[PDB]
Design an enzyme around this catalytic site. Sequence first.
Site, short mmCIF file in Angstrom:
data_model
loop_
_atom_site.label_atom_id
_atom_site.label_comp_id
_atom_site.label_asym_id
_atom_site.label_seq_id
_atom_site.Cartn_x
_atom_site.Cartn_y
_atom_site.Cartn_z
N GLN A 19 25.13 25.48 19.79
CA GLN A 19 24.42 26.20 18.73
C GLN A 19 24.92 27.63 18.54
O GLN A 19 24.73 28.22 17.47
CB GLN A 19 22.92 26.17 18.96
CG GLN A 19 22.44 27.03 20.09
CD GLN A 19 20.96 26.93 20.29
OE1 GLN A 19 20.46 25.92 20.77
NE2 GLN A 19 20.25 27.99 19.97
N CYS A 25 18.20 25.50 17.82
CA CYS A 25 17.92 24.43 18.76
C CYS A 25 17.01 23.38 18.14
O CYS A 25 17.15 22.19 18.40
CB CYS A 25 17.30 24.98 20.03
SG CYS A 25 15.78 25.86 19.77
N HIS A 164 11.90 26.43 23.21
CA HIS A 164 13.24 25.90 23.09
C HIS A 164 13.12 24.41 22.72
O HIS A 164 12.34 23.70 23.33
CB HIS A 164 13.99 26.10 24.39
CG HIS A 164 15.41 25.62 24.35
ND1 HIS A 164 16.26 25.92 23.31
CD2 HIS A 164 16.13 24.86 25.21
CE1 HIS A 164 17.44 25.36 23.53
NE2 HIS A 164 17.38 24.71 24.67
N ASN A 184 20.70 19.15 25.71
CA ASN A 184 20.56 20.53 25.23
C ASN A 184 21.57 20.74 24.12
O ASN A 184 22.39 19.84 23.84
CB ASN A 184 20.75 21.50 26.40
CG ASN A 184 20.18 22.89 26.13
OD1 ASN A 184 19.66 23.17 25.05
ND2 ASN A 184 20.31 23.78 27.11
C1 LIG Z 1 16.02 27.60 21.02
C2 LIG Z 1 16.24 28.29 19.73
O1 LIG Z 1 17.37 28.30 19.25
C3 LIG Z 1 15.20 29.00 19.24
C4 LIG Z 1 14.99 30.48 19.46
C5 LIG Z 1 15.93 31.17 20.42
C6 LIG Z 1 15.59 32.42 20.79
C7 LIG Z 1 16.44 33.21 21.74
N1 LIG Z 1 14.16 28.32 18.69
C8 LIG Z 1 12.88 28.18 19.34
C9 LIG Z 1 12.32 27.35 18.26
C10 LIG Z 1 10.91 26.85 18.30
C11 LIG Z 1 10.17 27.33 19.56
N2 LIG Z 1 10.28 27.36 17.07
C12 LIG Z 1 10.06 28.65 16.78
O2 LIG Z 1 10.36 29.52 17.59
C13 LIG Z 1 9.82 29.03 15.36
C14 LIG Z 1 10.08 30.20 14.95
C15 LIG Z 1 9.86 30.52 13.65
C16 LIG Z 1 9.38 29.67 12.85
C17 LIG Z 1 9.12 28.51 13.29
C18 LIG Z 1 9.33 28.20 14.51
C19 LIG Z 1 10.94 25.32 18.30
C20 LIG Z 1 9.51 24.80 18.17
C21 LIG Z 1 11.58 24.71 19.57
N3 LIG Z 1 13.06 27.06 17.17
N4 LIG Z 1 14.28 27.70 17.45
#
Ligand SMILES: *CC(=O)[C@H](C/C=C/C)n1cc([C@@](C)(NC(=O)c2ccccc2)C(C)C)nn1
Length: 217
Positions: A19, A25, A164, A184
């Site tokens: 990614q 993710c 994550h 992952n």
């Molecule tokens: C793992 C990833 O790429 C990331 C954030 C990385 C940060 C260093 N990520 C986490 C998520 C989750 C947790 N959703 C949200 O964070 C999110 C944020 C904003 C709007 C909606 C959802 C999902 C549920 C795993 N998404 N990307």
Amino acid sequence: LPDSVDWREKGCVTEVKYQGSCGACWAFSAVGALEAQLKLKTGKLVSLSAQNLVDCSTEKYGNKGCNGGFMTTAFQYIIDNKGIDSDASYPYKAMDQKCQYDSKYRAATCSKYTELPYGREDVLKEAVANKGPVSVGVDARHPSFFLYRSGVYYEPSCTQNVNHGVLVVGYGDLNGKEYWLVKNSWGHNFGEEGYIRMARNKGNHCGIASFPSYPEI
Ligand SMILES: *CC(=O)[C@H](C/C=C/C)n1cc([C@@](C)(NC(=O)c2ccccc2)C(C)C)nn1
């Protein structure tokens, strides 16, 4: 249910993706789950476009592209949109872009998705055995996760709060140390060729069962 499952053995899991600098993710988790369903339906294994989700499954779906999103609402976009493009046709660039979906390159569809009950590792096990790989959230905010190389991962400081998005592609054990087999999206140099085995049946460890879903073609 089988004692052990590994959907890679059924040719239902694509190569581990990377990614990079984009928080996508959730998109990789969603496409990976649908990739298995596409294989099961059509007999073809095709990497699906995480970028398509990043660019197109946006504000309407509560998603923020490289700043995060939800596997569930990504599936809803695929349903609403009546398709997702192949990764080959709509390649991943680890950045937010204008939505460039083209139905000509549609590689999968989604009719529905199922969300599993919070914390039920028994129900998740059944789903992984009987339906396919399940998109899940986990708590990966501990250096032990990034530093994981091998074995069954247990981190006492883990919480059930998800931050994550990954993909459960199987489960098994080592002489009673039960685990979830997790794909992952940090490339093949993370963990065991891009996979982490995470403690199973240890109290919803790292929130493995906090936020599970799987799509259907
Ligand atoms: C793992 C990833 O790429 C990331 C954030 C990385 C940060 C260093 N990520 C986490 C998520 C989750 C947790 N959703 C949200 O964070 C999110 C944020 C904003 C709007 C909606 C959802 C999902 C549920 C795993 N998404 N990307």
